[PDB]
Design a protein around this nucleic acid. Structure first.
Lengths: 63, 76, 177, 88
RNA sequence: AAAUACCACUACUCCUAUUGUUUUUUUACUUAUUCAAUGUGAAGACAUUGUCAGGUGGGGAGUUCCUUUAGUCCCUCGAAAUUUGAGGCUAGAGGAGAAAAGUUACCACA
């Protein structure tokens, strides 16, 4: 959109990229408070085992 | 600019590589998603784009001259 | 509050280019469609976000006391002078910068001129009367000024000899207390 | 030595035009530089006299060209503003 | 502060149910609306837009309000209950005009 006229693919990719950005942001807020010194990585090794693949915005998208 | 005479000429001759550094910085992502990186005594004429990228990055981050003067912001 | 005029902008940018390399960096647009603009309250120039200036427009002129970062003051004769409040922006974009030891950092903070007996690191190829931001050995922005001699002259200079002329130091924050 | 501003010296018309001069002791209308393009052109001129002498002819030409492009963009934006405020 | 026996009233806080009202948030769909074309397609109840109440206005056009003092204990708003604060009235005192102007037992130079 300065190509083709395939608005179906256009809309599908715009919603895809919006959801990818939302998931990246979601990772920002839940990772902003994690300590990752190079000799102590307990929090990052215990980061998100307790969350299942439907809570994430991209999980909702994919399901 | 990594030639000796040009290095000593730098300030007098107004030879600034800020444009090249910024261009490499802005093109890193496009090169990362490029699919033809490895589709390939010389110091310039190198057949592989990833080899060229390592030469650029070595010149920038690890220059032969003033290696302990590189801006930390650039390095990071 | 009002924007700067053409002559005022020219003078302010002349001083800022005397002390810095890149100024399109200062006036460049940001990600959120916002940019840094210049404002004037009383006889002082303020480096501010456009959004902050627009949202501070509602404040009355006689009751607005500061905005963004105070960059300096326009003198009675129409001459701009920078400030230790303007030190940070000079720190991001300094052209020439001179480091001093602790035994010279304390004198500079008291308000003295830098000496090569205090210097511990130089900037190569520095003209005689240029723009140098004074740091300590911990890369802490300590002040700014104009150097007195070139690098070669300072090296061949007497260890007890003035190398830089002080214009502002961080001790003025103990003035305005 | 006394300043030409202090002395009441009339402006003289030369190859550099005087233009429409303003009456003395009256309201000199303040034109404001708050546009990104106007800041660009003023900045380009300032950096030009700050850098000064360049050995390379192409480098000098590029410096002059960036100043010219700044003026061109400023003029275009001002003309567009004129059109916008004259029609709408 | 308030004292419990006796028996009367309504006052909040937290929950439940249906025999009902509204408002807000998220999501879904097009008919509001936005964009492209000529001899129908896309986005979407969000934007955009409009009306009032206001704040700032060193810019443009036109012309030449608060604070203090003393008083009647005269009126309104706010607060606490057994008293106050802010305004209101009477008349003294403060604040040709964005070009610049005035001023200092101060600094630097001459």
């Amino acid at each position: 959109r300065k190509g083709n006229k395939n608005a179906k693919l256009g809309s599908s990719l715009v919603v895809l990229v919006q959801k990818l950005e939302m998931n990246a942001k979601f990772i920002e807020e839940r990772r902003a408070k994690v300590d990752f010194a190079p000799k102590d990585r307990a929090q990052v090794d215990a980061f998100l085992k307790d969350l299942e693949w439907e809570k994430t915005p991209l999980g909702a998208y994919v399901v | 600019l990594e030639g000796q005479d040009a290095h000593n000429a730098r300030s007098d001759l107004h030879l600034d590589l800020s444009f090249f550094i910024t261009n490499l910085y802005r093109s890193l992502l496009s090169l990362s998603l490029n699919p033809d990186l490895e589709l390939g005594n010389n110091k310039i004429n190198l057949q592989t784009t990833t080899v060229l990228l390592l030469r650029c990055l070595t010149s920038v981050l690890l220059p032969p001259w003033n290696i302990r003067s590189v801006p930390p912001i650039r390095l990071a | 509050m009002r924007p700067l005029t053409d002559q005022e902008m020219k003078i302010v940018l002349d001083k800022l280019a005397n002390y810095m390399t890149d100024l399109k960096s200062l006036i460049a647009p940001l990600e959120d469609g916002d940019r840094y603009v210049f404002r004037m309250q009383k006889d002082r120039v303020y480096y501010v976000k456009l959004s902050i200036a627009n949202i501070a427009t509602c404040v009355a002129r006689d009751k607005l006391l500061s905005l963004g970062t105070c960059l300096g003051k326009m003198t009675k004769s129409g001459k701009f002078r920078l400030h230790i409040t303007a030190l940070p922006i000079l720190a991001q974009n300094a052209r020439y910068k001179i480091w001093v030891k602790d035994n010279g950092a304390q004198p500079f903070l008291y308000g003295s001129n830098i000496v090569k007996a205090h210097v511990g690191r130089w900037t190569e190829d520095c003209p005689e009367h240029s723009g140098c931001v004074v740091y300590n050995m911990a890369d802490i922005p300590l002040g700014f000024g104009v150097t007195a001699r070139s690098t070669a002259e300072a090296r061949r200079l007497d260890p007890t000899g003035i190398v830089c002329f002080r214009q502002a130091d961080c001790g003025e924050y103990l003035r305005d207390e | 030595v006394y300043s030409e501003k202090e002395l009441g010296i009339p402006q003289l018309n030369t190859v550099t035009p005087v233009g429409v001069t303003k009456p003395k002791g009256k309201k000199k209308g303040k034109v404001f530089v708050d546009d990104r393009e106007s800041m660009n052109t003023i900045l380009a001129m300032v950096e030009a006299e700050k850098q000064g002498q360049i050995e390379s002819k192409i480098m000098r030409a590029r410096q002059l060209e960036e100043i010219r492009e700044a003026r061109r963009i400023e003029a275009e934006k001002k003309e567009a503003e004129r059109k916008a405020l004259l029609e709408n």
